[PDB]
Amino acid sequence: YIETSIQKVTVDCKQYVCNGFTRCEKLLVEYGQFCSKINQALHGANLR
């Protein structure tokens, strides 16, 4: 058996960090430079 690939899992940074709570999302707008890097990093891994 030779493995050739793995599942491609993409993560919604806003929904994972704040579970749909508007009070948490308001604090998270100070972040987002970190969410934008996590979304793009998993995009490149799944694209390759």
Partner: protein
């Protein structure tokens, strides 16, 4: 519950959304991954 019924309690869910984008023609479309079209129409 006090009305004689047993209720299942599930966590609140969110429908996934993806964007199909063609830069050269500047076209786009929406993909609701693993969601039936009837659910999208109704909600």
């Amino acid at each position: 519950s006090d009305d004689g019924n047993y209720y299942c309690v599930r966590p609140c869910v969110s429908v996934p959304v993806s964007v199909i984008y063609d830069k050269s023609t500047n076209l786009h479309a929406t993909l609701f991954g693993s969601v039936a079209c009837e659910h999208v129409t109704t909600m």
